[PDB]
Design a protein around this ligand. Structure first.
Ligand SMILES: Cc1cnc(Nc2ccc(C(=O)NC3CCN(C)CC3)c(F)c2)nc1Nc1ccc(Cl)c(NS(=O)(=O)C(C)(C)C)c1
Length: 127
């Protein structure tokens, strides 16, 4: 069962900004999670064909991954920090929705989420 196109990462007509909070989301939050030993399953859209998960995009209707987030941050795609924070939370939630408690993929997401929460706890006040 086929893969959908990836989430949008480019849109010239979308209003967008670089803010100090969005800079922190790239330089601290994304960079910290990306380098982690458990990042790799989350570094690109789920290939439900290669993984033989024909139900994946039937259950997960708002897919998100760090590859997409990375491109959005590098392209300054976002208007505000909350939009990016929502993408991270969608990614984590999607993992917990699709999978079973205690599964390896869930343990991996939980480790990344713990770090995510620690970093966003120190999100700087907007300049
Ligand atoms: C972001 C994300 C969210 N959820 C799931 N879930 C999921 C859940 C399950 C199967 C699975 O391999 N199911 C069976 C295996 C036996 N077959 C005969 C039928 C399919 C599956 F590959 C992925 N993956 C994600 N990404 C992801 C990307 C690459 C890989 Cl290689 C994996 N595989 S994983 O989860 O087994 C591992 C990381 C612990 C090795 C996962």
């Amino acid at each position: 069962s086929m893969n959908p196109p990836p989430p949008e990462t480019s849109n010239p007509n979308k209003p967008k900004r670089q803010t100090n909070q969005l800079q922190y989301l790239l330089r601290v939050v994304l960079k910290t999670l990306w380098k982690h030993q458990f990042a790799w399953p989350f570094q690109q859209p789920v290939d439900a064909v290669k993984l033989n998960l024909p139900d994946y995009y039937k259950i997960i209707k708002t897919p998100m991954d760090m590859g997409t987030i990375k491109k959005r941050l590098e392209n300054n795609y976002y208007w505000n920090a909350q939009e990016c924070i929502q993408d991270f939370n969608t990614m984590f939630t999607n993992c917990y929705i699709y999978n079973k408690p205690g599964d390896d993929i869930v343990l991996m997401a939980e480790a990344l989420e713990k770090l995510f929460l620690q970093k966003i706890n120190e999100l700087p006040t907007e300049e």
